[PDB]
Amino acid sequence: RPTFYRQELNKTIWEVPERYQNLSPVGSGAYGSVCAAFDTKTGLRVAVKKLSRPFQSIIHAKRTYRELRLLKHMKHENVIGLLDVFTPARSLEEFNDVYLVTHLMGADLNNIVKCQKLTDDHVQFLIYQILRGLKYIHSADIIHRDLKPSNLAVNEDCELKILDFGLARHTDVATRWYRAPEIMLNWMHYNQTVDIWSVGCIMAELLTGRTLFPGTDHIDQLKLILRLVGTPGAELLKKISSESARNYIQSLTQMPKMNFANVFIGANPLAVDLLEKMLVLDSDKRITAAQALAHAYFAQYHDPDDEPVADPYDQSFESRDLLIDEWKSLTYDEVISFVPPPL
Ligand SMILES: O=C1c2ccc(Nc3ccc(F)cc3F)cc2CCc2ccc(OC[C@H](O)CO)cc21
Numbered sequence: 001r002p003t004f005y006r007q008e009l010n011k012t013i014w015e016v017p018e019r020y021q022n023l024s025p026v027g028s029g030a031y032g033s034v035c036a037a038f039d040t041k042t043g044l045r046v047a048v049k050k051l052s053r054p055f056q057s058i059i060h061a062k063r064t065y066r067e068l069r070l071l072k073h074m075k076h077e078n079v080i081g082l083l084d085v086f087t088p089a090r091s092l093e094e095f096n097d098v099y100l101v102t103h104l105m106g107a108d109l110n111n112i113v114k115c116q117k118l119t120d121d122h123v124q125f126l127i128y129q130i131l132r133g134l135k136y137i138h139s140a141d142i143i144h145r146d147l148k149p150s151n152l153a154v155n156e157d158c159e160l161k162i163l164d165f166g167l168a169r170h171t172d173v174a175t176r177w178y179r180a181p182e183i184m185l186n187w188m189h190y191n192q193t194v195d196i197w198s199v200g201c202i203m204a205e206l207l208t209g210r211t212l213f214p215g216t217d218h219i220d221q222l223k224l225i226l227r228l229v230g231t232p233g234a235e236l237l238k239k240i241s242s243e244s245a246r247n248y249i250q251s252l253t254q255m256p257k258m259n260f261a262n263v264f265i266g267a268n269p270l271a272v273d274l275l276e277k278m279l280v281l282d283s284d285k286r287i288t289a290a291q292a293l294a295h296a297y298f299a300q301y302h303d304p305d306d307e308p309v310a311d312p313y314d315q316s317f318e319s320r321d322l323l324i325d326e327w328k329s330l331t332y333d334e335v336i337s338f339v340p341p342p343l
């Protein structure tokens with residue numbers, strides 16, 4: 001147990017072990033806020049996230065445990081991971097606060113457009129890194145569900161890491177634009193290629209410099225999607241159980257599929273080809289993360305000997321209805337049992 005010190009930053013109070021110096025606010029999300037700091041022990045620049053009100057309620061309590069159990073498991077260079085987790089508290093009885101530490105990264109993909117086009121070779125490297133971490137996350141049976149630009153952390157080296165949650169507020173971007181259609185129609189079931197649609201939307205935005213589907217609401221969103229990929233045929237229509245949605249889609253001016261080739265004019269025809277394969281309405285035919293790595297577009301990066309899969313991940317807790325106290329005590333066990341990686 002190290003020596004802690006306190007500081008106030010933006011009316012958040014921070015209590016941290018002194019190894020972390022020069023705390024500097026970077027921003028906040030719904031579930032906590034994030035500081036940049038210097039880790040004197042390791043010599044690295046780090047991001048420390050103070051969870052906000054971890055244990056306000058069964059929802060929060062279970063979310064905190066989820067996050068701690070999630071980030072403890074991720075060990076892959078395209079997936080954010082844990083350098084440290086700590087609590088200022090000395091017993092379970094006084095346990096209230098969770099801090100999580102990771103590599104400082106310095107920006108998010110939202111922040112490294114400036115509304116602008118990147119060259120074909122950054123796109124390749126970027127979408128590559130995303131898919132590479134995606135292969136890994138999916139191999140653990142996890143589905144991200146909310147892959148968007150702000151959920152992607154990138155450094156000066158154009159090295160990229162998938163965040164669990166990115167920042168809504170920066171000290172110094174709508175979900176729906178990137179959501180697979182099956183999720184917008186509240187399908188009670190999906191597969192992992194839900195994230196692939198998202199990668200498609202991101203990719204598209206990088207090559208063109210503009211959002212693929214800037215829907216003003218969830219209905220507008222679908223209208224936009226259908227315009228590009230065309231209204232669904234019968235074999236897809238047979239699969240929607242809900243009359244209201246079916247009736248809506250069928251009540252639409254039926255639209256043909258566009259020539260992606262005419263819409264992504266200018267782009268590496270290989271790029272274009274990958275898009276076709278990611279942005280298919282029917283989740284059964286979208287290319288997977290592991291398949292897309294083998295798509296020619298990534299030839300200068302692909303290496304199946306260096307595209308690792310994850311240890312299997314116990315998600316049984318996801319189905320349990322426990323008390324705040326139990327959820328709390330589980331999280332605590334996880335703070336306590338934390339093994340840091342080697343430097
Ligand atoms: O690196 C970044 C990062 C890192 C982590 C994290 N959440 C998180 C997740 C898990 C964990 F354990 C600890 C955590 F902090 C969220 C982000 C947000 C994207 C971002 C945006 C801007 C940045 O720098 C602005 C400065 O001004 C320097 O230029 C840095 C980062």
Ligand SMILES: CCCCCCCCO[C@@H]1O[C@H](CO)[C@@H](O)[C@H](O)[C@H]1O
Nearest residue numbers: 074079080143144145146162163164
């Ligand atoms: C760190 C790599 C693992 C990524 C897993 C992301 C875990 C976040 O789970 C999130 O909870 C939200 C709140 O209801 C959901 O709506 C989002 O779809 C989901 O991404």
Ligand SMILES: CCCCCCCCO[C@@H]1O[C@H](CO)[C@@H](O)[C@H](O)[C@H]1O
Nearest residue numbers: 181182187189190222281282283284
């Ligand atoms: C934009 C409106 C079109 C809606 C079509 C979305 C197609 C969703 O795709 C469906 O995913 C299901 C699981 O989620 C699978 O059981 C189906 O086979 C698959 O077609």
